[PDB]
């Protein structure tokens, strides 16, 4: 309806509770493997944040897999930084990790992260 | 780390994508039954928004159920309004539905919704 009221902090409060479920390993339903490093997550949060995961988990065969192996070129630290961003809205971008984070965000099809990485690199040139 | 940057709209953008998955019936994993009316949802979103659903899906036996039956006193329209609020941050509160919405939010242990319902009722007295 047109007459709805809106609670400003609701979306942020939901994301904090989803990150608390991840931290306690509650109802996690997939393991992402990055060069023998394993990361547990919720398929729905991965799909909401990444074009690659949206395509994977909407596929009639892949939607049923409990393990997904990423390309061997992907850096585990870069993936870890992006997984934390998905669940918190906070991105730990540093001089020593920006190239690996940008390459990982391009592969995962995370448009806003790619755009910010490009702007931060352009400023140092 | 202390040096993180933050994307302001991220949490709202994630919630919109979770509501799009609900609308298309993608990766929904539970049916909530309210007096023979059925509602499909994601257990993680229900747990993030409700103290009752957090308790249900953290129970070692109930976490594995694909169907949950609510108390027969619960109004299906009141539940529908609250499920839409969970996935959007928007609450369709009207003179004709406020008593049913408040009773349903008390049962579901949704503290912010109960508090606002109480304030809107107090204003009309």
């Amino acid at each position: 309806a047109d007459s709805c009221i809106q609670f400003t902090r609701h979306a942020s409060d939901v994301l904090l509770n989803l990150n608390r479920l991840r931290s306690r390993d509650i109802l996690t339903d997939v393991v992402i493997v990055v060069s023998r490093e394993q990361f547990r997550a919720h398929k729905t949060v991965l799909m909401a944040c990444s074009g690659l995961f949206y395509s994977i988990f909407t596929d009639q065969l892949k939607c049923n897999l409990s393990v997904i192996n990423l390309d061997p070129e992907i850096n585990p630290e870069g993936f870890c930084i992006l997984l934390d961003f998905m669940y918190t809205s906070r991105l730990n971008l540093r001089e020593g990790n920006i190239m690996a984070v940008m390459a990982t965000a391009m592969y995962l099809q995370m448009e806003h992260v790619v755009d910010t990485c490009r702007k931060f690199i352009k400023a140092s040139e | 780390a202390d040096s993180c940057i933050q994307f302001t709209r991220h949490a709202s953008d994630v919630l919109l994508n979770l509501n799009r998955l609900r609308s298309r019936d993608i990766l929904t994993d539970v049916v909530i039954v309210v007096s023979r009316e059925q509602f499909r949802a994601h257990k993680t979103v229900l747990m993030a928004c409700s103290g009752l659903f957090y308790s249900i899906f953290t129970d070692q036996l109930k976490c594995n159920l694909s169907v949950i039956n609510l108390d027969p006193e619960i109004n299906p329209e009141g539940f529908c309004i609250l499920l839409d609020f969970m996935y959007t941050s928007r609450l369709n509160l009207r003179e004709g539905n406020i008593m049913a919405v408040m009773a349903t939010a008390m049962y579901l242990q949704m503290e912010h919704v109960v508090d606002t319902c109480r304030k809107f009722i107090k204003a009309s007295e």
Binding site: I5, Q6, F7, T8 | R90, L91, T116
Partner: peptide, 5 residues
């Protein structure tokens, strides 16, 4: 919190 969106 609550606002008119």
């Amino acid at each position: 919190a609550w606002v008119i969106p």
